[PDB]
């Protein structure tokens, strides 16, 4: 997994690769790792995948209830504070490692959070097995006062470094852009540098190839009338 977050002029961008693995095996070639805590607060997770999803949904749910209760749009510091207190309580047993990015009435924000419950602030971050490849790129090209276009470019280049150099990362680049005073734009499959080449041969079988003992119609309907 490679995930990055990059602050720019008037907002923040996050990106992720799309390979999910089971050990050394690729289970899903086009996983969507960019999750929504709230409309303008997005995050991406490394570590135990069920924990990152579960913890995202739980805090996303409580954030929505909080927002309804207070009649205010959700803040990134609230997502952060609730995540870290939940994770700290479980002493690292919930293996959630997240980059959290968003905009709110207070401004644009970028945070990382570690499974034991520590958090960090920054202008650019990376996470996952490809985090060192990505950070090499971010440390080479990042500057103060990036434009939106430069930030999307930098973030996706950082993911590409993970895709090509980290075996844990692969396939496509997903991006989400959160500019102040605008809707967040989720760019699914923003880059597509890994189409499977056409195979040499069709493996479609002649019908009747497979040996069969019994056929029956399965009753998927409920109890019939009359």
């Amino acid at each position: 997994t490679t995930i990055v977050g990059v602050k720019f002029n008037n907002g923040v961008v996050i990106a992720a690769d799309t390979r999910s693995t089971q050990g050394p095996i690729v289970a899903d070639k086009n996983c969507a790792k960019l999750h929504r805590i709230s409309p303008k607060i997005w995050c991406a997770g490394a570590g135990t995948a069920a924990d990152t999803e579960a913890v995202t949904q739980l805090i996303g749910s409580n954030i929505e209830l909080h927002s309804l209760y207070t009649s205010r749009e959700p803040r990134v510091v609230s997502a952060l504070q609730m995540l870290k207190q939940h994770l700290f309580k479980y002493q690292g047993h919930i293996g959630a490692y997240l980059i959290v990015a968003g905009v709110d009435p207070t401004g644009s924000h970028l945070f990382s959070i570690h499974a034991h419950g520590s958090t960090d602030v920054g202008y650019y971050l990376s996470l996952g097995s490809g985090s060192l490849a990505a950070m090499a790129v971010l440390e080479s090209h990042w500057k103060q006062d990036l434009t939106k276009e430069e930030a999307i470019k930098l973030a996706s280049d950082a993911i590409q470094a993970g895709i090509w150099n980290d075996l844990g990362s692969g396939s496509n680049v997903d991006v989400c852009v959160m500019e102040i005073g605008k809707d967040a734009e989720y760019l699914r499959n923003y880059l597509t540098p890994n189409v499977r080449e056409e195979k040499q041969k069709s493996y479609k079988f002649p019908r009747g190839t497979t040996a069969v003992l019994k056929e029956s119609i399965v009753n998927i309907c409920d109890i019939q009338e009359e």
């Binding site: 390979r19 693995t21 050394p24 095996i25 690729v26 070639k29 097995s129 895709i163 090509w164 150099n165 980290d166 075996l167 844990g168 990362s169 692969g170 396939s171 540098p193 890994n194 499977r196 080449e197 195979k199 040499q200 041969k201 493996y203 079988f205 002649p206 019908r207 009747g208 190839t209 497979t210 040996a211 069969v212």
Partner: protein, 222 residues
């Protein structure tokens, strides 16, 4: 504590045809989640129309191949330039491997060539030297992804003649070198998609009575 072994990934595939043999392997070399090299050749021409690959721990693999090539050279010196037949090479490699029975070469070895009647031959070895002649053998990381495919598409296992519903097996037709290469490439393309240690390049060595030819193909690099 010092671990004298490592794992360098890689996958290899040997198929024996009627009058040819192919030995293929990806060219990627890895440790853990890093790529060491996108092109580090793994299948070698060992002389006397024999090709060899020793997959797993690369230091042991290189040591073995390098000892075997040496054994071919000394066979020539000691036996008046007599050509080393594939069966004799196989037996010799067993002794190289078993000589380190209590500190094994951590590799899965495959050799390919022609037997003494000009028929294609593939031999497969375990790390400590048990071996057998086989028609078809994948080795290394993606072996478990590739073998069942080959069972189905070379030996036609579980394929019956349409209309006979399970009474007549699909007959084992004889494969050309062009057909075998297609299966090899599709095998490595699938393995590349589904196994993180397989990619970058495919290098195939084809053995015939005319000698050893080399083919190379790009694989996805992620």
């Amino acid at each position: 504590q010092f671990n004298p072994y490592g794992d360098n990934g890689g996958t290899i595939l040997g198929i024996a045809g009627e009058d040819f043999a192919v030995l293929a392997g990806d060219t990627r070399n890895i440790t853990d989640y890093s790529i060491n090299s996108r092109y580090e050749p793994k299948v070698f021409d060992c002389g006397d129309n024999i090709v060899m690959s020793a997959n797993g721990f690369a230091a042991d693999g290189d040591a073995l191949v390098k000892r075997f090539k040496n054994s071919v050279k000394w066979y020539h010196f000691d036996h008046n330039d007599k050509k080393l037949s594939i069966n004799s090479a196989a037996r010799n490699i067993q002794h190289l491997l078993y000589g380190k029975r209590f500190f094994p070469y951590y590799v899965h070895t495959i050799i390919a060539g022609l037997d003494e009647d000009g028929k294609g031959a593939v031999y497969s070895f375990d790390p400590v030297g048990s071996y057998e002649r086989e028609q078809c053998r994948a080795g290394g990381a993606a072996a478990s992804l590739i073998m069942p495919f080959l069972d189905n598409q070379v030996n036609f296992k579980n394929q019956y003649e349409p209309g006979t519903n399970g009474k007549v097996k699909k007959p084992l037709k004889y494969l050309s070198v062009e057909e075998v290469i297609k299966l090899v490439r599709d095998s490595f393309t699938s393995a590349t998609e589904r196994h993180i240690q397989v990619g970058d390049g495919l290098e195939i060595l084809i053995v015939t009575k005319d000698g050893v030819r080399k083919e190379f193909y790009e694989l996805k690099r992620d």
